[PDB]
Symmetry: D2
């Protein structure tokens, strides 16, 4: 029947109805998965948004910068899914880099305190999440994080590129640790998606050009307005169908990164 | 099934240890309807394929044969019925003459030999795609088999060069395939104990090569964060089926590593 | 000399086994005029640098110190004379607290520790470039030190993550540096027997880590087609000087591997 | 004094005065190197062109598809540089792919006989050259070939991209063999240069756009009309200043391959 039938999966990172996490969660539920959701800060808002999912799922608070949150997470998840049950899947869909580290703001003018906070949330927390949740994961399990290909520099993405580069490195080490539990760890490198995070002059035309250029570069085409292909890719990694891939990066980007022009 | 209703051509079965044999087995278990192609030893391939979960038509295909390639689409169509198309194609074909591997010095492989190996192992990926794309459905998937050649290694020699060529070919096939709504990708598998692999470890391409490849196998499992069972092609087969499925719809021109994660680890 | 007439800032000398010590030595032998920066143990650095081929001014620089960075250009200018500019900058600076390496579990490094290591090892490459670019000549060259982090490995742990960050930072520094006609690159060196390296092999970060890194060293020379002498930083120093010279004028945002070719070989 | 003083270096691949090899040879001679030149087919023409170099150098015939040429090469070189002397450097600057494997001609319509010939000349011959010349190279020596970054597909370059991908693989193995002699083997991945090989509709404007785009992508800028930066990079690899790099690729491309946009 379903790709993820009877799988118990934690999904972090829903803040709006256009969040990549929201669509991962939707597709997961459509594929039979039982979800536990984690949210940061605006919990009333997130509750409202998660009520728009196909099925009701427990919502837990998790600020990845808060050590007490991380320390209590496994026990809170356990209360949510019942004692004796474990997670088969964990989705990290969390990213942040202050504005000083982004966009038209000069690369050299981002204070390290700002960069450090961004690396904390966007890269380090992937290890933190794994640390907190691996002790309640089943063998055969899967941890997935969200990446945006940082192998080459580019305008605007700036210090977030550096954080993603750090994330890829972190992922390779998480895989070493996860392996001990029989759990895989991977990243999905997504093409650009018009989530509300796109906010990070003539931004509109330029973002549309990004869309047209990415679609042209991608041999199978690309639609920035549609998170679904990315959500399906995450679910694939959550499933039993990529059992020998770990510490690795799957590109759900239309194939654009394989083409120079 | 993961592949329910899908029509999929699978090449490259020669024995029951063939990676393609296991791709076929898993695909069938997941509801796929198959067309098989075999090279040269058709009687062998017939009795081998007779041990798959379901019966499937077996077609002849020598990728060096222009007539075979030119007639392939029509022969496949006769196999699956007029009006039907393929949703999937598996290229599981490789060859490099002995002079191009093992303890034979790298400089001593004649180009005639290397060129044959590149023909079969790399170019045929393009020519198969050319042959079959006009009878593939949008949403379709072409998959080939790779052995990561980004770094040199003992004994693999000119086959390494062939695989590097294959990776480059794959990126261009994706450009063509995309015009049909079809994806093209490679699976880079870890080392699998096929009959040939065991022979190599046992010194068939020379004793020094054997010892080196024995070490390669062992280091592979050591480096793989989830470990690596060289006697089990199933994880590789599942990965191929993942790419044949609707669940990786935005991946093309790319390489998926079904290697236990070994290529992500230095040691 | 390869670097005749060039004015070059070299950071990162702490002892006579420092990679930067040898970069400085070779640069001076090739006609370069140096400005040195030292962190914290200035008396030690003074007597160490006193053993270089020529005397060079020594300036204080803690890359975590905003005042140090803000005054650096002016202090360098006082060192080399008004009207003169730097043709070269060497970043040879790395640190990661012990919790972020060795047998200490990867999950147990507090972020405060990791963040300090990333500050010193990666961000400071940007901030040094910011500090010094306004007093660099067109044709100039910024070089930093890298240890290839494309694949994970034992014990290196969070320093690996720092180096991955450094590589990404380097690509952005190149975008800024290019506006001045300045190149930015990293040299990925093979493992060098510094005092710290020997300590690690001898179990200073834990016995299991020691054994793993001992094996890393040996496999490195094994895999390197020209071999690798871990007791000799000179080939690494020469490579840095190559990038500081006029002979790689079209390379920027990039990584040169001075590792014996080991990263090109699986085994 | 000179970067390559007293070094004996073989340079293949001069066909015109805009050949990358011609400028490698010019810069090498300016840096004190003694050269032996090899040429293919139009030897009268090549002689005329090589007379325009800073210093006279022996010209030897070498069709890399001709096994007798390869077999006699070391002895012919030895006659050129005198008995007892050896080569310190070898430049492979040779490339060919028939038109069917290029440009507007559909990727699928290149016959393998055409592709095979291109791979023979552009990739396999790098191993052949090394095989023929390594027995007369000094330890500390250097073999360099010319590459154009094939890690991603692109319009027009087509099957030549596949040949270059093959070349990079060949180079990693040549390095294993060259190492036994104390010799390095590397490739220089050049940005696009307006040599007469650029011939491979509105080609002019498009080639100019290639120039503007490459210059923009390259953080240090790029001039397609100027082979000199590439020639200097080859000489660097020929020199004693990159003694620990082998089996590797140096990018003389303005840094363009390190930037997505
Ligand atoms: N949108 C794109 O184009 C794109 C492309 C590739 C990769 N990504 C990655 O995908 C993931 C989701 O991004 P998105 O596009 O859905 O935008 P988003 O804003 O909807 O999701 C980002 C999430 O991070 C969460 N978060 C921020 N700080 C946190 C903290 N201290 N503790 C816990 N959670 C915190 C936010 O609350 C939010 O839900 C990120 O890692 C992002 O970098 C996005
Ligand atoms: N076994 C491994 O460890 C390993 C690892 C990674 C990738 N691969 C790749 O997987 C694929 C299958 O190889 P295998 O290991 O299952 O061994 P195999 O011998 O069972 O399969 C190779 C196939 O190539 C077919 N073939 C050879 N010449 C042909 C031609 N002219 N026309 C049509 N078919 C032809 C053979 O008949 C055979 O069925 C290859 O591309 C191989 O390089 C193998
Ligand atoms: N030794 C190896 O095998 C190896 C291999 C590849 C790359 N590297 C890199 O080479 C560089 C030099 O390291 P090394 O091996 O010569 O050891 P080292 O200890 O001799 O040099 C490291 C330097 O970092 C300086 N430093 C630390 N914190 C600083 C700060 N807050 N401000 C300014 N300087 C500071 C130290 O004072 C010291 O001089 C580093 O970036 C290192 O990671 C080392
Ligand atoms: N021009 C560019 O933009 C560019 C960019 C990157 C790499 N490259 C590479 O640089 C090298 C030189 O190319 P170029 O631009 O100077 O064009 P070119 O035509 O001037 O040089 C190519 C050379 O290959 C030689 N050659 C062809 N077949 C041969 C054979 N059978 N035997 C011996 N020699 C043979 C030719 O005679 C010629 O001298 C090539 O390998 C090419 O692919 C060129
Ligand atoms: C070349 C154009 C770059 C496109 C970037 C795509 C992209 C990549 C992203 O990583 C992203 O997510 C964030 C980015 C910043 C912050 N603070 C928070 C988040 C969640 C959004 N988008 C849209
Ligand atoms: C020396 C081999 C080490 C590589 C191990 C993995 C591996 C990689 C392979 O590409 C492979 O397939 C072939 C290789 C050569 C030929 N002629 C035919 C085939 C089918 C088998 N194996 C086992
Ligand atoms: C566990 C280490 C294995 C890596 C070997 C090579 C290597 C790589 C290095 O990056 C390195 O430099 C440091 C690493 C950490 C700190 N705190 C400070 C420094 C200066 C030393 N060495 C020797
Ligand atoms: C995206 C645009 C592609 C630019 C390609 C640059 C480029 C790369 C090349 O490899 C090249 O050299 C040849 C190519 C073909 C043949 N038959 C012979 C030769 C010598 C020329 N040029 C000009
Ligand atoms: Cl809660
Ligand atoms: Cl048939
Ligand atoms: Cl001072
Ligand atoms: Cl002659």
């Amino acid at each position: 029947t379903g790709l993820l039938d009877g799988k118990r999966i934690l999904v972090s990172g829903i803040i709006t109805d256009s969040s990549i996490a929201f669509h991962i969660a939707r597709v997961a539920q459509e594929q039979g998965a039982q979800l536990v959701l984690t949210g940061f800060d605006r919990l009333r808002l997130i509750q409202r948004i998660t009520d728009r999912l196909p099925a009701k799922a427990p919502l837990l608070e998790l600020d990845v910068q808060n050590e007490e949150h991380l320390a209590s997470l496994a026990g809170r998840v356990t209360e949510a899914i019942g004692a004796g049950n474990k997670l088969d899947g964990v989705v990290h869909s969390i990213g942040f880099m202050p504005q000083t580290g982004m966009g038209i703001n000069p690369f050299f003018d981002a204070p390290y305190a700002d960069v450090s906070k961004g690396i904390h949330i966007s890269a380090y927390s992937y290890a933190s999440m794994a640390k907190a949740l691996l002790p309640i994961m089943n063998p055969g399990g899967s941890i997935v994080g969200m990446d945006f290909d940082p192998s080459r520099a580019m305008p605007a993405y700036n210090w977030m590129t550096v954080a993603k580069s750090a994330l890829e490195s972190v992922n390779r080490f998480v895989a070493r640790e996860a392996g001990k539990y029989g759990v895989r760890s991977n990243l999905v490198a997504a093409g650009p998606i018009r989530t509300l995070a796109m906010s990070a002059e003539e931004a509109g035309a330029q973002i549309q050009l990004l869309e047209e250029g990415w679609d042209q570069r991608a041999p199978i085409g690309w639609n920035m307005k549609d998170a679904t292909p990315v959500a399906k890719t995450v679910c694939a990694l959550l499933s039993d169908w990529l059992p020998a891939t770990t510490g690795d990066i799957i590109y759900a980007d239309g194939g654009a990164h394989t083409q120079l022009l």
